[PDB]
């Protein structure tokens, strides 16, 4: 079986890359400006100092993640202002200046789809999502203009049609197929990108994978805050009343269980919050690998990078995450043929060198693998070894010589 | 995003107000992470300057349907 | 930090167990040493858990190191930007205390001169394509070269193939293609 | 109890095996496109330099 | 292991002989020439 006809296909892909960098403090959470409590805690061990340690560790880890995944470029390339990319039309994913910040249409959709008293603050990230967008625009202009050469170093421009010819050549579909079908492939590309647009705008919230990081973290914070309302066995929950009601020599007692309960709650919180990030950065490392292998090059590794055979990938940002577009080659309309391993001619077998030997019923032909393109059998594309007896299973045919009739001139 | 007029040179950031840096108007491939784009360095008479970061050099490549 | 935790009372009378032994042996010794035990037990447990997480981290890095060894060393990879930066030639390992140190030997092209390209060279109505590499021009003499290092050669049937029409394809040029069999057939 | 049931998992392993016996790798990219086993093994050998 | 004769259909030509290290002579075969009998 072999395919007559094929479709370019465009798939989306989502990934978490980081999460909001909270930071909740010791003395405020536990008791918050009640120096009686402070004097009671100072002689507990060095617990909460090193809690603060761990948590700020998570916080710096987040921006380490974002810089490993996005700063995989070294400069800022930008696209030339004459959009003559040979039929292919990326105008939906490149920037548009009159959008307020330098987002892009699909970026802006992704942004519009997804949506204090207790010492617990939220630091701001170290890259501004504007800068993130500027990186991704740089990556787009890079992998578009310069081919994929800039994987190595100084970018080396090369026209887009040539580049996609090389992309095809990297999955065993000889160059010509592109040039002969350029217009068709271009229209396919365009309608696919447009379908992505209209899907995402009218999709369900199927950016859900980024939703889960934020929902989990925020519900954990709700539990931590709410925990402050439990008596924990003391006279009353509110510390400003326990202090202001009982005598000191009595106070120490009722404050004791309150301190131990709130500490144990804080430790449970930080213990879970460590594992949150310890898996987020696994995802982040996966995103860095996908970015470099897919965007700055081509991946011969079947189904690492969106399915079908692989051609090109484009990145886009998202709030605390990244979103790839994968552009792949897939065969759709197949058809029957009957084959055999080798062609015995004049007492010597022949095997083909790249493509399969294929028949339409009467004659025989040589074709490449993944897109039907019949040809005659000539000494050029085949090669010989030995008789035609050992090779199990065989069918007879005539091998034409591209030299004899020209020689017979 | 709160106001440092409430503090008991001077600047303002999306993360707070840092006290001491001369705020400058050029951007460098910058060292120290402060916040939300602002990032400091010791340079030149000499002091600490806190300033907007810049993601890198700009090299807009020439492209043409028949070059290589 | 763990050891320092032994110098703290956790809300008891002292930071040693022997003193509480000396002062008060009957039940109040229980209602005090209770706290020493509880606190010290936490400190140990909360050492163990974060040590366990750090262990997870090091195992992740160890498995990355294993894959990197058995791809960069014992073979030649084509995952791009895995073994270093640039096209990958080779690697050698070295061993540092508690870790490993890879020397990646990579091949990177630096000088760049530009030319003018074209998809195909029609002739007699048929269109040749290169077997590998692009066509290229210094202005007059079209040469065909591999994509990654400038060394030109003369265009030939033997390093091209055919598609016998030059109209559907967009952006062709015209030029003679050389043929080695004709001059050797002149004899 | 688990969601997929070990009988169902056996059906997936049977299918994912039948595919690779009959049609080579192709059924990971689209629809299966048949080749006879011997030829498929020949093309694997070609894929590793022999 | 699979010995073959050395001809134009399995070797290509790059440049001169006297710059590569440790080259040797041997007679390249040109299977056009036996057919170059006319
Ligand atoms: C590339 O695709 C975009 C996608 O819309 C095309 O944009 C339209 O361009 C026309 C100009 O002829 C405008 O009047 C429309 O408002 C644009 N949008 C739509 C939805 O039609 C664009 O024409 C295509 N080609 C180029 C060269 O940009
Ligand atoms: C191969 O497939 C492509 C699309 O999958 C076909 O393109 C369209 O085919 C229909 C059917 O005749 C035409 O009406 C359309 O005009 C074609 N599209 C364009 C943009 O022209 C293509 O015809 C198929 N070719 C073969 C030989 O099957
Ligand atoms: C199978 O392929 C052969 C090869 O092209 C086709 O045979 C051609 O048939 C037409 C008339 O039907 C002749 O004018 C051509 O000269 C034939 N070609 C050759 C090379 O002899 C054949 O039609 C195809 N289909 C079938 C069912 O056999
Ligand atoms: C596939 O197996 C069939 C068996 O039916 C082979 O058919 C040949 O012809 C008849 C079938 O009635 C048998 O007596 C022969 O022994 C079969 N030959 C062989 C080699 O099996 C068919 O040839 C086989 N396919 C290939 C490619 O060998
Ligand atoms: C390679 O790219 C450079 C950069 O655009 C081109 O440089 C200019 O080319 C024009 C036309 O010959 C000259 O008049 C200028 O003096 C060049 N600029 C410099 C700084 O030297 C160059 O032309 C391109 N190569 C070709 C063959 O066109
Ligand atoms: C590649 O881009 C150039 C840039 O405009 C195109 O140049 C035009 O080419 C046509 C036909 O070759 C001429 O009639 C025009 O006069 C050219 N433009 C100018 C400003 O002189 C060129 O056509 C493009 N290549 C292709 C294949 O379309
Ligand atoms: C390239 O060289 C060929 C070789 O003569 C010529 O092709 C002519 O192209 C024009 C363009 O329409 C045709 O009208 C002629 O019939 C073609 N043949 C001849 C003999 O003139 C022409 O010199 C060049 N072609 C182009 C498109 O530049
Ligand atoms: C391969 O190694 C051998 C062993 O050293 C080299 O043999 C020497 O070759 C030089 C040629 O300039 C002679 O003068 C020496 O006498 C040789 N050594 C001995 C022990 O006789 C050989 O040269 C090397 N290969 C090449 C191409 O130089
Ligand atoms: C390879 O063969 C060539 C020619 O067949 C040898 O070239 C000889 O070079 C010497 C110079 O030292 C001349 O005196 C000879 O006349 C040349 N020809 C022959 C046939 O000897 C060359 O020496 C050979 N290389 C080796 C390593 O033997
Ligand atoms: C295949 O062709 C050879 C060439 O003469 C012939 O001897 C042999 O009988 C043919 N095979 C069959 C099955 O007829
Ligand atoms: C706080 O700073 C913002 C930003 O400069 C400013 O708009 C606002 O007026 C300030 N608030 C006060 C009370 O000065
Ligand atoms: C801010 O930028 C302007 C731009 O002209 C410059 O004149 C001015 O000196 C800059 N401010 C400082 C403190 O350098
Ligand atoms: C192109 O290169 C050839 C060398 O084969 C040379 O003789 C010719 O003059 C060159 N043309 C230009 C315009 O540099």
mmCIF file with all atom_site columns, N, CA and C in Angstrom, chain A residues 372-406:
data_model
loop_
_atom_site.group_PDB
_atom_site.id
_atom_site.type_symbol
_atom_site.label_atom_id
_atom_site.label_alt_id
_atom_site.label_comp_id
_atom_site.label_asym_id
_atom_site.label_entity_id
_atom_site.label_seq_id
_atom_site.pdbx_PDB_ins_code
_atom_site.Cartn_x
_atom_site.Cartn_y
_atom_site.Cartn_z
_atom_site.occupancy
_atom_site.B_iso_or_equiv
_atom_site.pdbx_formal_charge
_atom_site.auth_seq_id
_atom_site.auth_comp_id
_atom_site.auth_asym_id
_atom_site.auth_atom_id
_atom_site.pdbx_PDB_model_num
ATOM 1   N N  . UNK A 1 372 ? 3.487  8.647   -3.998  1.00 0.00 ? 372 UNK A N  1
ATOM 2   C CA . UNK A 1 372 ? 3.575  7.932   -5.260  1.00 0.00 ? 372 UNK A CA 1
ATOM 3   C C  . UNK A 1 372 ? 4.129  8.842   -6.343  1.00 0.00 ? 372 UNK A C  1
ATOM 4   N N  . UNK A 1 373 ? 5.100  8.334   -7.084  1.00 0.00 ? 373 UNK A N  1
ATOM 5   C CA . UNK A 1 373 ? 5.741  9.070   -8.162  1.00 0.00 ? 373 UNK A CA 1
ATOM 6   C C  . UNK A 1 373 ? 6.433  8.057   -9.058  1.00 0.00 ? 373 UNK A C  1
ATOM 7   N N  . UNK A 1 374 ? 5.683  7.361   -9.901  1.00 0.00 ? 374 UNK A N  1
ATOM 8   C CA . UNK A 1 374 ? 6.243  6.212   -10.615 1.00 0.00 ? 374 UNK A CA 1
ATOM 9   C C  . UNK A 1 374 ? 7.338  6.607   -11.586 1.00 0.00 ? 374 UNK A C  1
ATOM 10  N N  . UNK A 1 375 ? 8.258  5.669   -11.808 1.00 0.00 ? 375 UNK A N  1
ATOM 11  C CA . UNK A 1 375 ? 9.320  5.813   -12.791 1.00 0.00 ? 375 UNK A CA 1
ATOM 12  C C  . UNK A 1 375 ? 9.621  4.456   -13.404 1.00 0.00 ? 375 UNK A C  1
ATOM 13  N N  . UNK A 1 376 ? 10.407 4.465   -14.480 1.00 0.00 ? 376 UNK A N  1
ATOM 14  C CA . UNK A 1 376 ? 10.793 3.222   -15.131 1.00 0.00 ? 376 UNK A CA 1
ATOM 15  C C  . UNK A 1 376 ? 11.951 2.598   -14.367 1.00 0.00 ? 376 UNK A C  1
ATOM 16  N N  . UNK A 1 377 ? 12.237 1.337   -14.655 1.00 0.00 ? 377 UNK A N  1
ATOM 17  C CA . UNK A 1 377 ? 13.356 0.645   -14.030 1.00 0.00 ? 377 UNK A CA 1
ATOM 18  C C  . UNK A 1 377 ? 14.598 0.847   -14.875 1.00 0.00 ? 377 UNK A C  1
ATOM 19  N N  . UNK A 1 378 ? 15.604 1.488   -14.304 1.00 0.00 ? 378 UNK A N  1
ATOM 20  C CA . UNK A 1 378 ? 16.835 1.698   -15.047 1.00 0.00 ? 378 UNK A CA 1
ATOM 21  C C  . UNK A 1 378 ? 18.027 1.277   -14.204 1.00 0.00 ? 378 UNK A C  1
ATOM 22  N N  . UNK A 1 379 ? 19.183 1.082   -14.839 1.00 0.00 ? 379 UNK A N  1
ATOM 23  C CA . UNK A 1 379 ? 20.366 0.679   -14.092 1.00 0.00 ? 379 UNK A CA 1
ATOM 24  C C  . UNK A 1 379 ? 20.772 1.745   -13.089 1.00 0.00 ? 379 UNK A C  1
ATOM 25  N N  . UNK A 1 380 ? 20.293 2.969   -13.280 1.00 0.00 ? 380 UNK A N  1
ATOM 26  C CA . UNK A 1 380 ? 20.690 4.061   -12.411 1.00 0.00 ? 380 UNK A CA 1
ATOM 27  C C  . UNK A 1 380 ? 20.181 3.913   -10.988 1.00 0.00 ? 380 UNK A C  1
ATOM 28  N N  . UNK A 1 381 ? 18.893 3.666   -10.787 1.00 0.00 ? 381 UNK A N  1
ATOM 29  C CA . UNK A 1 381 ? 18.347 3.634   -9.441  1.00 0.00 ? 381 UNK A CA 1
ATOM 30  C C  . UNK A 1 381 ? 18.434 2.264   -8.784  1.00 0.00 ? 381 UNK A C  1
ATOM 31  N N  . UNK A 1 382 ? 18.900 1.241   -9.493  1.00 0.00 ? 382 UNK A N  1
ATOM 32  C CA . UNK A 1 382 ? 19.012 -0.096  -8.933  1.00 0.00 ? 382 UNK A CA 1
ATOM 33  C C  . UNK A 1 382 ? 20.477 -0.475  -8.795  1.00 0.00 ? 382 UNK A C  1
ATOM 34  N N  . UNK A 1 383 ? 20.711 -1.647  -8.216  1.00 0.00 ? 383 UNK A N  1
ATOM 35  C CA . UNK A 1 383 ? 22.057 -2.178  -8.080  1.00 0.00 ? 383 UNK A CA 1
ATOM 36  C C  . UNK A 1 383 ? 21.983 -3.690  -7.941  1.00 0.00 ? 383 UNK A C  1
ATOM 37  N N  . UNK A 1 384 ? 23.034 -4.360  -8.382  1.00 0.00 ? 384 UNK A N  1
ATOM 38  C CA . UNK A 1 384 ? 23.001 -5.802  -8.590  1.00 0.00 ? 384 UNK A CA 1
ATOM 39  C C  . UNK A 1 384 ? 23.860 -6.505  -7.555  1.00 0.00 ? 384 UNK A C  1
ATOM 40  N N  . UNK A 1 385 ? 23.514 -7.768  -7.285  1.00 0.00 ? 385 UNK A N  1
ATOM 41  C CA . UNK A 1 385 ? 24.371 -8.651  -6.500  1.00 0.00 ? 385 UNK A CA 1
ATOM 42  C C  . UNK A 1 385 ? 23.955 -10.088 -6.803  1.00 0.00 ? 385 UNK A C  1
ATOM 43  N N  . UNK A 1 386 ? 24.780 -10.790 -7.568  1.00 0.00 ? 386 UNK A N  1
ATOM 44  C CA . UNK A 1 386 ? 24.613 -12.220 -7.736  1.00 0.00 ? 386 UNK A CA 1
ATOM 45  C C  . UNK A 1 386 ? 23.511 -12.649 -8.681  1.00 0.00 ? 386 UNK A C  1
ATOM 46  N N  . UNK A 1 387 ? 23.150 -13.924 -8.606  1.00 0.00 ? 387 UNK A N  1
ATOM 47  C CA . UNK A 1 387 ? 22.109 -14.484 -9.450  1.00 0.00 ? 387 UNK A CA 1
ATOM 48  C C  . UNK A 1 387 ? 20.738 -14.013 -8.976  1.00 0.00 ? 387 UNK A C  1
ATOM 49  N N  . UNK A 1 388 ? 19.697 -14.571 -9.590  1.00 0.00 ? 388 UNK A N  1
ATOM 50  C CA . UNK A 1 388 ? 18.329 -14.380 -9.129  1.00 0.00 ? 388 UNK A CA 1
ATOM 51  C C  . UNK A 1 388 ? 17.729 -15.676 -8.602  1.00 0.00 ? 388 UNK A C  1
ATOM 52  N N  . UNK A 1 389 ? 18.495 -16.426 -7.811  1.00 0.00 ? 389 UNK A N  1
ATOM 53  C CA . UNK A 1 389 ? 18.004 -17.687 -7.274  1.00 0.00 ? 389 UNK A CA 1
ATOM 54  C C  . UNK A 1 389 ? 17.836 -17.626 -5.763  1.00 0.00 ? 389 UNK A C  1
ATOM 55  N N  . UNK A 1 390 ? 18.837 -17.105 -5.056  1.00 0.00 ? 390 UNK A N  1
ATOM 56  C CA . UNK A 1 390 ? 18.809 -17.146 -3.599  1.00 0.00 ? 390 UNK A CA 1
ATOM 57  C C  . UNK A 1 390 ? 17.710 -16.253 -3.052  1.00 0.00 ? 390 UNK A C  1
ATOM 58  N N  . UNK A 1 391 ? 17.531 -15.069 -3.636  1.00 0.00 ? 391 UNK A N  1
ATOM 59  C CA . UNK A 1 391 ? 16.622 -14.093 -3.052  1.00 0.00 ? 391 UNK A CA 1
ATOM 60  C C  . UNK A 1 391 ? 15.203 -14.643 -3.084  1.00 0.00 ? 391 UNK A C  1
ATOM 61  N N  . UNK A 1 392 ? 14.691 -14.985 -1.909  1.00 0.00 ? 392 UNK A N  1
ATOM 62  C CA . UNK A 1 392 ? 13.469 -15.767 -1.790  1.00 0.00 ? 392 UNK A CA 1
ATOM 63  C C  . UNK A 1 392 ? 12.285 -14.949 -2.273  1.00 0.00 ? 392 UNK A C  1
ATOM 64  N N  . UNK A 1 393 ? 11.583 -15.458 -3.273  1.00 0.00 ? 393 UNK A N  1
ATOM 65  C CA . UNK A 1 393 ? 10.496 -14.716 -3.869  1.00 0.00 ? 393 UNK A CA 1
ATOM 66  C C  . UNK A 1 393 ? 11.071 -13.708 -4.835  1.00 0.00 ? 393 UNK A C  1
ATOM 67  N N  . UNK A 1 394 ? 10.584 -13.689 -6.070  1.00 0.00 ? 394 UNK A N  1
ATOM 68  C CA . UNK A 1 394 ? 11.089 -12.769 -7.078  1.00 0.00 ? 394 UNK A CA 1
ATOM 69  C C  . UNK A 1 394 ? 10.115 -12.775 -8.243  1.00 0.00 ? 394 UNK A C  1
ATOM 70  N N  . UNK A 1 395 ? 10.151 -11.718 -9.047  1.00 0.00 ? 395 UNK A N  1
ATOM 71  C CA . UNK A 1 395 ? 9.357  -11.694 -10.269 1.00 0.00 ? 395 UNK A CA 1
ATOM 72  C C  . UNK A 1 395 ? 10.221 -11.177 -11.411 1.00 0.00 ? 395 UNK A C  1
ATOM 73  N N  . UNK A 1 396 ? 10.025 -11.722 -12.608 1.00 0.00 ? 396 UNK A N  1
ATOM 74  C CA . UNK A 1 396 ? 10.781 -11.345 -13.792 1.00 0.00 ? 396 UNK A CA 1
ATOM 75  C C  . UNK A 1 396 ? 10.338 -9.988  -14.308 1.00 0.00 ? 396 UNK A C  1
ATOM 76  N N  . UNK A 1 397 ? 11.250 -9.314  -15.000 1.00 0.00 ? 397 UNK A N  1
ATOM 77  C CA . UNK A 1 397 ? 10.964 -8.089  -15.732 1.00 0.00 ? 397 UNK A CA 1
ATOM 78  C C  . UNK A 1 397 ? 12.198 -7.748  -16.553 1.00 0.00 ? 397 UNK A C  1
ATOM 79  N N  . UNK A 1 398 ? 12.095 -6.688  -17.350 1.00 0.00 ? 398 UNK A N  1
ATOM 80  C CA . UNK A 1 398 ? 13.203 -6.241  -18.185 1.00 0.00 ? 398 UNK A CA 1
ATOM 81  C C  . UNK A 1 398 ? 13.787 -4.965  -17.595 1.00 0.00 ? 398 UNK A C  1
ATOM 82  N N  . UNK A 1 399 ? 15.105 -4.943  -17.401 1.00 0.00 ? 399 UNK A N  1
ATOM 83  C CA . UNK A 1 399 ? 15.773 -3.716  -16.987 1.00 0.00 ? 399 UNK A CA 1
ATOM 84  C C  . UNK A 1 399 ? 16.316 -2.995  -18.210 1.00 0.00 ? 399 UNK A C  1
ATOM 85  N N  . UNK A 1 400 ? 15.834 -1.779  -18.436 1.00 0.00 ? 400 UNK A N  1
ATOM 86  C CA . UNK A 1 400 ? 16.293 -0.958  -19.541 1.00 0.00 ? 400 UNK A CA 1
ATOM 87  C C  . UNK A 1 400 ? 17.643 -0.349  -19.197 1.00 0.00 ? 400 UNK A C  1
ATOM 88  N N  . UNK A 1 401 ? 18.468 -0.160  -20.221 1.00 0.00 ? 401 UNK A N  1
ATOM 89  C CA . UNK A 1 401 ? 19.790 0.422   -20.056 1.00 0.00 ? 401 UNK A CA 1
ATOM 90  C C  . UNK A 1 401 ? 19.794 1.830   -20.631 1.00 0.00 ? 401 UNK A C  1
ATOM 91  N N  . UNK A 1 402 ? 20.075 2.860   -19.829 1.00 0.00 ? 402 UNK A N  1
ATOM 92  C CA . UNK A 1 402 ? 20.071 4.233   -20.350 1.00 0.00 ? 402 UNK A CA 1
ATOM 93  C C  . UNK A 1 402 ? 21.280 4.573   -21.201 1.00 0.00 ? 402 UNK A C  1
ATOM 94  N N  . UNK A 1 403 ? 22.081 3.588   -21.600 1.00 0.00 ? 403 UNK A N  1
ATOM 95  C CA . UNK A 1 403 ? 23.295 3.849   -22.362 1.00 0.00 ? 403 UNK A CA 1
ATOM 96  C C  . UNK A 1 403 ? 23.259 3.208   -23.746 1.00 0.00 ? 403 UNK A C  1
ATOM 97  N N  . UNK A 1 404 ? 22.701 1.999   -23.851 1.00 0.00 ? 404 UNK A N  1
ATOM 98  C CA . UNK A 1 404 ? 22.792 1.241   -25.099 1.00 0.00 ? 404 UNK A CA 1
ATOM 99  C C  . UNK A 1 404 ? 22.169 1.958   -26.291 1.00 0.00 ? 404 UNK A C  1
ATOM 100 N N  . UNK A 1 405 ? 20.898 2.380   -26.259 1.00 0.00 ? 405 UNK A N  1
ATOM 101 C CA . UNK A 1 405 ? 20.346 3.050   -27.449 1.00 0.00 ? 405 UNK A CA 1
ATOM 102 C C  . UNK A 1 405 ? 21.071 4.334   -27.799 1.00 0.00 ? 405 UNK A C  1
ATOM 103 N N  . UNK A 1 406 ? 21.504 5.094   -26.794 1.00 0.00 ? 406 UNK A N  1
ATOM 104 C CA . UNK A 1 406 ? 22.341 6.261   -27.045 1.00 0.00 ? 406 UNK A CA 1
ATOM 105 C C  . UNK A 1 406 ? 23.694 5.850   -27.605 1.00 0.00 ? 406 UNK A C  1
#
